[PDB]
Design a protein around this ligand. Sequence first.
Ligand SMILES: Nc1ncnc2c1ncn2[C@@H]1O[C@H](COP(=O)(O)OP(=O)(O)NP(=O)(O)O)[C@@H](O)[C@H]1O
Ligand SMILES: Nc1ncnc2c1ncn2[C@@H]1O[C@H](COP(=O)(O)OP(=O)(O)NP(=O)(O)O)[C@@H](O)[C@H]1O
Ligand SMILES: [Mn+2]
Ligand SMILES: [Mn+2]
Lengths: 340, 340
Amino acid sequence: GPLGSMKDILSNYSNLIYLNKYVKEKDKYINDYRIIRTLNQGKFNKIILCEKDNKFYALKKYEKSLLEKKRDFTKSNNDKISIKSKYDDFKNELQIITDIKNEYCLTCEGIITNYDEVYIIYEYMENDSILKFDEYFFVLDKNYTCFIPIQVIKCIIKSVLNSFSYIHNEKNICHRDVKPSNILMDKNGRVKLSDFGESEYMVDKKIKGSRGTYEFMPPEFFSNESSYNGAKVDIWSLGICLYVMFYNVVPFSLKISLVELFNNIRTKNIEYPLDRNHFLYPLTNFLSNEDIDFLKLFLRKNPAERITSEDALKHEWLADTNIEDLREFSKELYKKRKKL
Amino acid sequence: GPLGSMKDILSNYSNLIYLNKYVKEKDKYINDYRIIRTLNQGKFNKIILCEKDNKFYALKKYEKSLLEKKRDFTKSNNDKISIKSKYDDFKNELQIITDIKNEYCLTCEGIITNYDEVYIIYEYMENDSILKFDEYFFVLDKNYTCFIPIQVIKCIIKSVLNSFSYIHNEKNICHRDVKPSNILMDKNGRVKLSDFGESEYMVDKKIKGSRGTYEFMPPEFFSNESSYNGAKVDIWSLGICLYVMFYNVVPFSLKISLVELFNNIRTKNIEYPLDRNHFLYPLTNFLSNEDIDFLKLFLRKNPAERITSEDALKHEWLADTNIEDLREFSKELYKKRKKL
Ligand SMILES: Nc1ncnc2c1ncn2[C@@H]1O[C@H](COP(=O)(O)OP(=O)(O)NP(=O)(O)O)[C@@H](O)[C@H]1O
Ligand SMILES: Nc1ncnc2c1ncn2[C@@H]1O[C@H](COP(=O)(O)OP(=O)(O)NP(=O)(O)O)[C@@H](O)[C@H]1O
Ligand SMILES: [Mn+2]
Ligand SMILES: [Mn+2]
């Protein structure tokens, strides 16, 4: 429940490496991993692009001394308050990173540490996340629109559903923050679920309560319930990703304000126009009945009535998934990147 | 409703100055206003500390070209969506800045512009805001605690209540974002309501709907209602400021997450311990029955049952307000600042 020190957590990890930073002719290295540049400066962690041998890697750096300040207010149990730190959250994440091994999930290849700074080694998914965000979602560039083709969307969903199978059924983990920025693609058309920073071990398939990214949170969270089926939470969020992949915009969600976001999620019907509709004005092809059908199975506001991952994978809509559409898509995308 | 261009809005302002920036021996000037340093770099606007003659000023810089990109999603009316910009929001703010004149409100002394960059001139409230925030609220320093004394709190509240009288009764404006960071104090013990960036003109005392800072928003906002009495919204928020002034922490609110914030506000009883309770642990005197009584009149979850500003000003609790407590407090505070 409340885990021990980092050392304890990692004591049974069989690829824990001693931290060794150094310079060799003004290129900075982490343990043979040559630091190229940083890919993403988060508020806390941060991912680093590196090279070792001839392969490419993304190392995620956390630091104890940094996240152990930044304390918040959890629940209570005892009503005698509760005091948690972002380092406490990371311990739980660490244990998970240590447990995940699957072709459909980003899995680390080693942990480098001094028990303060921590570098988790990951393969580098050269096509980054399936969509990118700033004021809205885009594929490659904020300037030309372009929506992901359906046949490719099919592949991605089937892929992430497969990773649900692993975490939910094999590992008993609820991902708890399934969003576009967390589905990574490589050049060859592999798609992987990543960032388990919000992930928790379920108790009888139930998850703790209310945590993740607001606009991806299910109606359940706005009830009296207090417990929710982990799987259905991740299903809902994939549904949103699906909606986002269709429209390049998040459904009822959107900025300013969040009361208006939350009075919405629990009760309100999602609008299903044609690809560009919420998007014709920022820039100053389109779907078909079946596409909206499938997607609506994910966004049943009542969770016991929401689609299973099993039913999903075996639904008619995915029965014509051709992995070659994704491989071709991913290949051309990679060719369009590093051209910028 | 939908106002015109900046020129139009300002056409009947009688102290609109032509922008004139220049250097005189590597001190940068705005129109005789010598730029000292910047006080607060917001996400958009920004406030500048300046000097002219021997007086001190805080100029708030906005820019058209900057906030006209940054568009969001308002309501609809027509269900044919609605597209607003942060520059649109500022037009409404501009009209208001142009209307407010009161000893209890920060009122501009001139607007300097080229119809893109805009500098609103304000007196400089040398004691800044009544409390400061980072991970929690503090008076001067994050290291020594110290709570504002009750007799001083009395003065501040009476002061802000007075400014409600002006905006609500004389001007028909709802402030809509009453919070500690917006109540400014000078060295001499004057306290002024400021930042009308969220402020709106009421229609039959009602305000539009759901806008401001989440943790200061009233229960009404979580109903079916759609319209709320402007005054009672500002009353609620002053109540929170009061709660914050008592405990140096925001009530049920607090970070992570907001569903947990909103399932709270609408239904849930506020806890009233003694000054340091939520605060004994960050740092690793105290109130009295009457104080909590008064404050509870502000935080009636039902707005038609919440305290008036009239009743407040004439309540027993303020009947012994001694302005000299604030003047002495403000004097010593100023002496403790610029000592850092
Ligand atoms: N193995 C990888 N290959 C390529 N890009 C990556 C990889 N890992 C992370 N990234 C990029 O870095 C971003 C953020 O990484 P993440 O592990 O989600 O950190 P975070 O602090 O949780 N950020 P966010 O999830 O956006 O709040 C991802 O969205 C990717 O764009
Ligand atoms: N006249 C003034 N004298 C002294 N300090 C000031 C003055 N005006 C603004 N400030 C400081 O600048 C801060 C932010 O100014 P404000 O006009 O609220 O901009 P903002 O972008 O709305 N920031 P926030 O309200 O915190 O989201 C205030 O909280 C004060 O600390
Ligand atoms: Mn992430
Ligand atoms: Mn403000």
